[PDB]
Design an enzyme around this catalytic site. Structure first.
Site, PDB file in Angstrom:
ATOM      1  N   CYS B 122       0.815  -1.223   0.000  1.00 12.88           N
ATOM      2  CA  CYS B 122       0.000   0.000   0.000  1.00 12.88           C
ATOM      3  C   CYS B 122       0.843   1.265   0.000  1.00 12.88           C
ATOM      4  O   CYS B 122       0.333   2.347  -0.278  1.00 12.88           O
ATOM      5  CB  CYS B 122      -0.953   0.015   1.189  1.00 12.88           C
ATOM      6  SG  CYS B 122      -2.114  -1.382   1.231  1.00 12.88           S
ATOM      7  N   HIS B 274      -3.034   7.362   2.476  1.00 16.90           N
ATOM      8  CA  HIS B 274      -3.528   6.103   1.950  1.00 16.90           C
ATOM      9  C   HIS B 274      -4.877   5.815   2.604  1.00 16.90           C
ATOM     10  O   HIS B 274      -5.032   6.011   3.805  1.00 16.90           O
ATOM     11  CB  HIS B 274      -2.504   5.017   2.297  1.00 16.90           C
ATOM     12  CG  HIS B 274      -3.052   3.629   2.302  1.00 16.90           C
ATOM     13  ND1 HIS B 274      -3.746   3.096   1.236  1.00 16.90           N
ATOM     14  CD2 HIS B 274      -2.961   2.645   3.228  1.00 16.90           C
ATOM     15  CE1 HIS B 274      -4.082   1.847   1.518  1.00 16.90           C
ATOM     16  NE2 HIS B 274      -3.614   1.548   2.718  1.00 16.90           N
ATOM     17  N   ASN B 305     -10.654   0.494   0.129  1.00 24.77           N
ATOM     18  CA  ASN B 305      -9.190   0.589   0.207  1.00 24.77           C
ATOM     19  C   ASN B 305      -8.519  -0.044  -1.021  1.00 24.77           C
ATOM     20  O   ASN B 305      -8.516  -1.266  -1.157  1.00 24.77           O
ATOM     21  CB  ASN B 305      -8.733  -0.091   1.499  1.00 24.77           C
ATOM     22  CG  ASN B 305      -7.236  -0.312   1.582  1.00 24.77           C
ATOM     23  OD1 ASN B 305      -6.460   0.056   0.692  1.00 24.77           O
ATOM     24  ND2 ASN B 305      -6.814  -0.893   2.703  1.00 24.77           N
TER      25      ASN B 305
END
Lengths: 349, 349
Positions: B122, B274, B305
């Site tokens: 990520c 993020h 996400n």
């Protein structure tokens, strides 16, 4: 209005050490010739390979990368904590995520250095060096570890006669550092995705997903039990296409790398191409018109083709066998699936 | 004796455009709650997610990456052939080799630009930006395409309560260019490989290999039928550790990025973390003492996400909704499996 701060930049960069990990298992041609119905003498003749490094189950990508990394660290007079970045170039680490690099960084005591894996096939080490060089010359990092590492034996089909028997396992590591004098020439690197399928896996991992999970849910495991070829994806190549490209296209890349470096073949102490095939290596060396004094890496005969590992492994062997090359110029050029390639002239550590 | 030539270096770098690909299928919590015995309410309160993006079979990693990239080229007034490097950050491309970047580079007409996939979970886009910044300021590239892209749906388990329902699919891309004025601040990036197993796959791809090939070559397909749970590796995480880590550690990394940028929270036009979890986003915002005027990215409520894609997607969305943020400073920070993290202050295009 606020001006953003910036890193200061050193003059240049340089490879300050090389490290190696070679599995002790050197498999001879004879062990492999059965399922591909060929012979020791044919293999030796087509590829110049006698033995290849084959890793055991315990010798994982992270295990091999770490050993190579540690040798490089010791030869550089450094420790893990001196590293500002860890780049691991591999396609055989059997996890989508997280990266192998993060394990390597931890094992060698480099935490909390940034750590990532790169996917650039056999050109992976040269891509790593381009990146490392960029990181050093932009002042992002003072010391960058680059590891080319593969356990290719995990993705070969023993019945495959296009590539399986060429491939070996191992790790080769280099440390790139800030320097006062230019030690790494401007990278010449590129891709041709039009030819993505030239060297590739037999099929997508999703086919494997779909089969195994359909079998698992429905209780019907045909399609698997009845499968004639492996479902586990394995490496394959159009051999003849690779040769034409590897030699006649990469020779232009090499001349371009020399030209951008400001260097003639006479200035080279060594030529270290990716160890794809002895036939490729020979024809390549001939095309570059090298003088007899340039040492050509031919590690492939005993190590086999170790992909990203191949160049630093060969560099490591060159220096052991001829310590006086240290401080000399070496042309390194890697090339593989993608298609991708990368080249630099480097001052050997 | 022989001095190697070196590339001239630009004064600085900056992001010149951002592009996006969002799958049209927005999946609400209700479609997911069954197999995890959960509820819409529980999901909103735990994660802030109302819907997540889900790609179709045709919406592969390259397809999405290409769409985002093309939008970015168009907005920058560039064509593919203006690019000098292509970086794709993804962990869901279903081929060990060659890379997705090689395909993407070809489709967009960026050949022969070098192209590679990066593995950094990520934090992948933030890693990519740090790399892109280094490439430009070292004079290795003048235009670098960076794409965070994932089809996480390929690697979720519908029965998994730890992460499955959190994840969405998509691509975000930026172009990083040579600049006279600093537009990207010094990266704060790192790893802690000691917590590699914190976010990880259920098991190695090799266990899949051993199970399928064994069944294939013995005809005994037990262990596949009557396997409780997926043989296909899927993503999972220790949620409370990721949260604890975000608040104890990542908040601090974010402050460091401001410090290294020479920038205050009052100087930010935007905060683009993020999109891990709405509660983490909100905790960050509070912890960093952001003034009301700073726009906080909360794409997560609609997109879910999207891992590496999350920051550029959220950035794209902020600029669509607040066009006047163009030219303002944005703090971006990504963090994920490894563990790994990256952060920079960036001037919005």
């Amino acid at each position: 209005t606020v001006t953003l701060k910036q890193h200061e930049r050193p003059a240049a960069s340089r490879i300050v050490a090389v490290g190696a990990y070679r599995p002790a298992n050197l498999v001879p041609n004879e062990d492999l010739i059965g399922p591909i119905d060929s012979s020791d003498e044919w293999i030796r003749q087509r590829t110049g390979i006698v033995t290849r490094q084959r890793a055991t189950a315990e010798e994982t990508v992270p295990v091999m990368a770490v050993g190579a990394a540690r040798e490089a660290l010791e030869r550089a007079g450094l420790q893990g904590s001196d590293l500002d970045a860890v780049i691991v170039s591999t396609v055989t680490f059997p996890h989508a995520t997280p990266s192998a690099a993060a394990l390597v960084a931890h094992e060698i005591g480099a935490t909390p250095a940034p750590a990532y894996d790169v996917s650039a096939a056999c050109a992976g080490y040269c891509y790593g060096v381009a990146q490392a060089d960029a990181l050093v010359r932009s002042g992002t990092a003072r010391h960058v570890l680059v590891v080319g590492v593969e356990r290719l034996s995990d993705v070969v089909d023993p019945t495959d006669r296009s590539i399986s028997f060429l491939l070996g396992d191992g790790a080769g590591a280099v440390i790139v550092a800030a320097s006062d004098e230019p030690g790494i020439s401007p990278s010449v690197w590129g891709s041709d995705g039009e030819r993505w399928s030239t060297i590739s896996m037999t099929h997508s991992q999703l086919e494997l997903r779909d089969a195994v999970e359909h079998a698992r849910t429905t209780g019907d495991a045909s399609a698997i039990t009845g499968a004639e070829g492996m479902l586990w994806p394995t490496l394959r190549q159009d051999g003849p296409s690779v040769f034409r490209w590897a030699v006649w296209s990469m020779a232009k890349v090499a001349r371009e790398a020399l030209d951008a470096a400001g260097v003639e073949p006479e200035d080279l102490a060594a030529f270290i191409p990716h160890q794809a095939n002895m036939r490729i290596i020979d024809e390549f060396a001939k095309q570059l018109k090298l003088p007899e004094s340039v040492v050509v890496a031919r590690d492939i005969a005993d190590a086999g083709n170790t992909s990203a590992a191949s160049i630093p492994l060969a560099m490591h062997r060159l220096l052991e066998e001829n310590p006086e090359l240290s401080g000399g110029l070496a042309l390194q050029i890697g090339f593989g699936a993608g298609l991708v390639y990368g080249a630099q002239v480097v001052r050997l550590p």
